[PDB]
Design a protein around this ligand. Structure first.
Ligand SMILES: *[C@@H]1O[C@H](CO)[C@@H](O)[C@H](O)[C@H]1NC(C)=O
Ligand SMILES: *[C@@H]1O[C@H](CO)[C@@H](O)[C@H](O)[C@H]1NC(C)=O
Ligand SMILES: *[C@@H]1O[C@H](CO)[C@@H](O)[C@H](O)[C@H]1NC(C)=O
Ligand SMILES: *[C@@H]1O[C@H](CO)[C@@H](O)[C@H](O)[C@H]1NC(C)=O
Lengths: 334, 334, 334, 334
């Protein structure tokens, strides 16, 4: 079975630094089959070689006896292990800009898992130059096949929003809610101490920002824009995404709490460094996150557990690897 | 006067472990007339002999002078007595499974009472084999007569939900809110210490789980399913029912508070073991519950009082004997 | 100018103890003109002589310099004075029952005032025997004239509710929201210590109920019923009205707070006994209340001030003299 | 490009003390270009000479490095400077009344700015005598041109509200929400200690009212009325505006918090006297305010920062220079 990834292209295209993004959420597959799963593309644009490389993850799972009706003596516990994951959406510093000038795609996937099954979400970031050739491509991810379909919308220059064409910025002024996708870029630096700005933007009891994760989020808005670096103090679009990421960390019911839990991240930690909540339910939100209390990014994969993403206390928390939401942008309709 | 109990049957039936359930809420009858009241059925499936047996209840009533306009010197008090109740929905361990293999029905009633009148709710759990003979039956409960009516819905295999047929699980994926009925099964065991899981799933200040009631809930979903044991950690449907039971204990206005009260459960208790709220109003929620702070189940019958079912403090609380609500199930429409 | 007071009568009338009530809210009149204002009726049913008698009130007003833009040195203060008010809705014990057997009306008025103007609300309680003669009457209250108009609704026995006829109690069961009017009856007695029941029904920090006002509320529901004594523990209709009175004391925007204030009730009190809130705005809620902390009822008239009617702390509070609202009653539509 | 300022006039006009007001919000202009910006009118009514005079402002800006993705080592700071602003809506005592008797207009502007751009809002208060000549005028404000357009509505005497004509006060009684514009008049006086009334009307922890700003607000309601002095204790319209000003100080999304900040007002203050919140976003609310903790009005201009206008703690707060909102007025429709 094949699934479609629609990437919208306007009639008028500006070349220079614009990248477009498409995504598709795939049906659930067993957790064991996600090992060594990597995107395999057949487009004329070679995928970036760094995405297929290994990223060390700390895998956190929960387990228990769980007999019918059993509420006690379950031996409910969490297990931390070091695992190698390839193809996840771990973007490196200046990878999007280099991929634009190299005409290379960025094809990666997110994992939304419970204890037994995973919903992969395949992402592809391609330069705007893919909006003229518009050659249909085929991507293989595990047992699934994805057809990249470029569609030329009836919009002249803007974004297709509910059958209307909105130009983020010559009509009258208007505000539109525009979709945005963000990825955390792990990069050490004295200017990238992220939680120093988390402490200023939000009512966050967050001490010791010197020892917390360093990096920034990079975002694509409207499915077609220049990359937005988050946070950027004098860029209100960037600060809107910053607000959305930390006020809605799972992104913008089948979820029942099994119990709270703590885990060692990484596995070699002398004490528990991450708080999580074990749950039962169909896969929903991402299982990929980054440990807060480590300058060097410790990537976490917690199938069946929701890591603590609330920032009101930075203790034993995490930040999401990917984030999707809506931000309000000024402009006009055409 | 006769009342109908509709039990829906699909055109395609799977035999193996499926049981169907029907219920009907009967008009109010005086409290004194509910004594020795037992279901009397005329079906081809003999009712389970254990339901008509005696279950010891602690009866908690409230009383006062209550002259017109009298607000003081009412001698407002509660009285605890040991009473024998037959035919209430007290299911034993593995009773539903044995009744399936024996082709026996489980006919029982719940009591929703105020100080003077009771609304009986008659339940019947029959094996799926009653969805082919579909012989109309007659059940007598006190002054009421109930006609069991099996109706073959136009659904192929699924459940009739608002004129649509939903198959809980080959169309597209969808989520549907499905009705569910649950009964507390009292059974001693080191794996059935229920409040050990209540403490983990909910923000519940609940100490000393060793001395609290032991057992599990058994549920039928969609009016047609295999029994669901609650809680089951790796069964998200079971954990959804678990969440609904303890977040909405009365199930999913004519109710005025007369005053808080405490009662000895059982009557021989040296101190008060249960907190309740005396009320005035037409009968609404169930008057049957089980004392929390006793490993051996102490069944409580409190006409005119609502027992403390909130779990945020397990002190002097109770759990419901029966629970009806809605849970979200994955599947498709046919 | 003349105003209408519609009193609805059903086609079928039950004689025995039923009284009907009508009311009309009159336009604002200057506060000084309300002195010695008494209802003057021209019906064939003589008004009860006790209503036109004097009831001692403690009058609480507020004053200040109040120059344009003046926010300081206003000398904002309250003044307590003993005044004689006639014709207000001060019902005596068993007055409604005696008026029924005597075929006498109870004609009285409520006062909703700000600092300068008053909205009188004229009430009339007549026995059900006024629903057959149905002779149109004329009542004079100050500068206003009121025509009592009896209208035979198309209802057989029930109450006209939104064009439908509801019979509070042979159709199917249903719940209807029914209008109700209540009056506080001041009567000393060891069974009428009202706040002893306020403490039990509501989460009310209310100590020393021995020294608080004694009496009960008497109510007419549906504009046609036997009198309902409030509170009556085993009468859920009575307890619904009890709940409405103390949860919605002003009854079931042009109101700006000038400032909190305390007053001596009665004027001879050695210290402040009542808390109030001075306001500016068009007349809205009643200015008549009864002091809480005095077994002998101290009637309060506070034009331009809202007395503390919240019961969460009984300190320096009051209770309303009259209350209008809605309660849910069981019955059927005809 | 020219923008319209519509000023509605009724068919019947009452001369005596009525003034009408119009306003227009202009597109954003760079912050540097707002210096020395003054309204230049071409009407037959000369603008009041005091508006074009200099008012000393304390200018509070925020700055930081703000590289793409930079969250730390931004050197985020605020800078206070003394600047001269002409033409802002700083009304003097009795200026509106003197302008009425002198047939002079009051033309001024408000500034809603972020760190880089400003939205000017041009106001004009003219005597009611401008509703007969109705000569179209031209006003120049910076790079913008404004055409004053007087329109004779189809209302006889009232205000045009959603296509209907409401007469604030011979039809039936009714309540209408009416627009109102208010300006803070700074005037020293023992009767103008504003926060003495703020403390009484609102639950405000506000000590030391002797050392807080002195003055009052002056308002025009319905775009046509006699001036309303705020607060006026016995004027419920005035107290409604008083409530709206302090409950909705910004008046009756593109706003992301960069961080809290404190500033010295005036620049010569030995310690920080004003709390603000630095933000990023398109210009929205006014950047003009008055320092609370100084009897002599200290006008503040904080482009890109929202001054603390919440009154629950008067510490380091401010009050708005201008306020627009809605108040409920009694009257009738014609
Ligand atoms: C995990 O998700 C799958 C697919 O939705 C579901 O079938 C399975 O029961 C889930 N496991 C849990 C909730 O433990
Ligand atoms: C109990 O319920 C019956 C039936 O609804 C009602 O008639 C009776 O008044 C109630 N008793 C109370 C509320 O004390
Ligand atoms: C009192 O009410 C009258 C009538 O609504 C009104 O005209 C008057 O201004 C009010 N006085 C106040 C609010 O002080
Ligand atoms: C200020 O507002 C202008 C106009 O809306 C906008 O272009 C600019 O980015 C804003 N500056 C910020 C938010 O720092």
């Amino acid at each position: 079975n094949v699934y479609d990834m629609k990437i919208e292209c306007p009639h008028t295209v500006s070349f220079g630094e614009n990248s477009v993004i498409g995504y598709v959420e795939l049906p659930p597959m067993p957790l064991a089959d996600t090992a060594q799963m990597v995107p395999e593309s057949s487009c004329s644009m070679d995928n970036h070689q760094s995405i297929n490389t290994i990223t060390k993850y700390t895998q956190v799972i929960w387990r228990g006896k769980a007999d019918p009706g059993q509420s006690s003596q379950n031996s409910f516990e969490t297990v931390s292990t070091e695992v190698d994951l390839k193809g996840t959406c771990v973007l490196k510093h200046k990878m999007v800009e280099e991929s634009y000038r190299s005409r290379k795609s960025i094809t990666c996937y997110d994992l939304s898992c419970n204890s037994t099954f995973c919903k992969p979400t395949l992402y592809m970031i391609v330069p705007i130059h893919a909006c003229n050739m518009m050659k249909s491509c085929l991507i293989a991810l595990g047992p699934y096949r994805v057809q990249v379909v470029y569609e030329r919308t009836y919009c002249m220059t803007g974004v297709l929003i509910e059958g209307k064409c909105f130009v983020p910025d010559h009509g009258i002024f208007d505000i539109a809610s525009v979709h945005v996708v963000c990825f955390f870029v792990a990069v050490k630096g004295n200017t990238y101490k992220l939680f120093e700005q988390v402490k200023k933007s939000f009512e966050s009891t967050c001490n010791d920002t010197e020892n917390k994760v360093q990096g920034y989020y990079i975002c694509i808005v409207g499915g077609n824009s220049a990359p937005i670096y988050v946070p950027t103090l004098d860029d209100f679009r960037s600060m809107e995404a910053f607000t959305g990421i930390f006020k809605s960390p799972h992104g913008e019911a089948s979820y029942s709490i099994v119990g709270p839990a703590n885990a060692k991240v990484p596995h070699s930690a002398s004490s528990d460094t991450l708080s999580l909540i074990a749950y039962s339910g169909i896969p929903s939100y991402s299982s990929l996150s980054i440990l807060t209390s480590s300058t060097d990014a410790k990537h976490v994969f917690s199938p069946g557990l929701f890591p603590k993403l609330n920032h009101t206390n930075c203790d034993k928390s995490a930040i999401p690897l990917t984030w999707t939401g809506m931000i309000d942008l000024p402009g006009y309709y055409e």
